[PDB]
Each structure stands twice: as structure tokens, then as C-alpha cells.
Amino acid sequence: GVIKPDMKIKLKMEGNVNGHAFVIEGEGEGKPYDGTNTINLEVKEGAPLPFSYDILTTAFNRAFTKYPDDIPNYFKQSFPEGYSWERTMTFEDKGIVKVKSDISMEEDSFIYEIHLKGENFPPNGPVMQKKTTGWDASTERMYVRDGVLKGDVKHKLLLEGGGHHRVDFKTIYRAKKAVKLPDYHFVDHRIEILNHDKDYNKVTVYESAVARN
Ligand SMILES: [Cl-]
Ligand SMILES: [Zn+2]
Ligand SMILES: [Zn+2]
Ligand SMILES: [Zn+2]
């Protein structure tokens, strides 16, 4: 099909967090049917970033999801035309991130164009003070509403010292053409920063995602 067993990734993110503008470019690759991918990111403008890189990593494509053969795959069916998505991440004490991303295909690769806006983070909280250590593993509930696919996940943003804060994710996924709609299901996530330089100008992200009934 058009979605190959090995797909490359090219992306660019343009964003603003508490008024700090930045641009990040990425390249990577993954195995769409295994639900795995790796992306190598470089800050091109706005370095060094004055906030936690973890608020960006889940914005850096559900085509990289292992799906059982009996659950229609909203994401892979949308190609080559592709899909866009929009997400809000609501943090416990006023921070909010809104993301819009366009996922397209060019031959054996995906291109992402990502716009991200973070606002109202407490200046002395763990996001703006870079006191986070990653995300827990999560489960996203996927369900069709208004003819498009919605996903919600309740996440723990892990903190230095071993605590965490709650972050609620709500995403809307919109195929650019009609596809066969799945029934209610789940996607289990793991995302990790595998390596980074000291101020996260260079970062490698690894993600796994597996759907189940
Ligand atoms: Cl390529
Ligand atoms: Zn099979
Ligand atoms: Zn290629
Ligand atoms: Zn690890």
C-alpha cells in the first residue's frame, strides 16, 4: 500500500511558549506497522529553549501505531491525502498548550508541519524551570464523534524528585478524505527522550504505540 513498512519522517515545528518563539526541524524514521519511530530534532531558532522539552515531544503521527487487523486504521487509510490533528494539553495550574499539525506524504516519507502555542505556565513551575523528567506510559481512548476521530489521555508529567503533575490531552484527528471508521478502542503509548545535549538543542525522541480493543 502507500504506507510502507519503513517510512522516513521530516518535520518542522514553529512555536511560542510563554511568548518565547522557536523553530525546530526534525528528521527520523519508523516502522508504521510495528508502531515505532525515532526522530532527531535540532533547534534552529530560539535556542536555548527556556522551558521543558517534554511539552514538545508528543507534538513531534498516529500512522506509527501497531493495530490489530480487526480494528480499522483511521490514520493509515487516510494516505496518501493524509490527515491533520489539533490538540489541547491542559496542565493542573493554568498552563495550556494548543497544537495543530498537518501530516502529509511524499513517496516513502511523511512530512509534519507543526504549530504549537503554550501559554500561562507559572514562571516558577516545573515546565518553565525545566524540572520535568518525562512522561509516564499512557493509554489514549479513541472514539468517533462528529464523524472524526477523538482521542483523550490523562498523563503524568514526571518531575525531578519523583513526583508528577497531571496533564489532560484532548485531540481531534481529521482525515482529509472519507475512510472506514473504527469502533471505540485504545492506544497504549510510551515516549522517551533517548538522548539530548545539555540544553536540548539536539534531541532524539523514541515513541511506541499499540492499539487494542
Ligand atoms: Cl525518504
Ligand atoms: Zn495480521
Ligand atoms: Zn524517500
Ligand atoms: Zn529509556
Side-chain angles (χ1 to χ4, degrees), residues 134-140 142-153 155 157-197 199-212:
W135 299 98
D136 63 333
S138 65
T139 301
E140 185 171 11
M142 300 284 198
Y143 59 102
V144 169
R145 293 284 174 270
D146 304 307
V148 298
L149 187 62
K150 293 199 177 175
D152 299 329
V153 41
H155 245 312
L157 177 59
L158 306 177
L159 297 183
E160 254 183 35
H164 70 269
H165 285 175
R166 178 169 160 182
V167 186
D168 287 337
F169 291 39
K170 301 200 51 175
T171 308
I172 305 173
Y173 306 91
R174 293 186 184 102
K176 291 183 176 177
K177 66 181 176 179
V179 306
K180 176 168 196 180
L181 301 177
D183 212 349
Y184 304 89
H185 59 284
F186 299 105
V187 177
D188 286 340
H189 292 282
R190 302 178 57 249
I191 190 169
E192 185 186 336
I193 294 181
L194 292 185
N195 47 86
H196 60 86
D197 69 339
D199 288 337
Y200 292 75
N201 297 318
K202 287 77 190 92
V203 174
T204 296
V205 166
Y206 176 75
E207 185 217 359
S208 172
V210 184
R212 59 180 161 86

Side-chain angles (χ1 to χ4, degrees), residues 67-70:
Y67 264 83
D69 298 341
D70 54 359

Side-chain angles (χ1 to χ4, degrees), residues 84-92 95-97 99-123 125-130 132-140 142:
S84 59
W85 59 261
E86 68 168 71
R87 179 177 291 161
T88 299
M89 298 153 70
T90 301
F91 291 69
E92 332 188 313
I96 290 157
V97 176
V99 193
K100 289 162 78 167
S101 187
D102 186 90
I103 315 301
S104 58
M105 212 175 83
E106 181 184 286
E107 302 296 343
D108 64 331
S109 70
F110 295 110
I111 293 164
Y112 320 160
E113 177 67 8
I114 309 163
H115 295 166
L116 184 147
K117 190 178 191 200
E119 299 176 58
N120 304 141
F121 284 102
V127 167
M128 297 311 295
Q129 296 287 132
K130 292 159 61 173
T132 72
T133 69
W135 299 98
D136 63 333
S138 65
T139 301
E140 185 171 11
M142 300 284 198

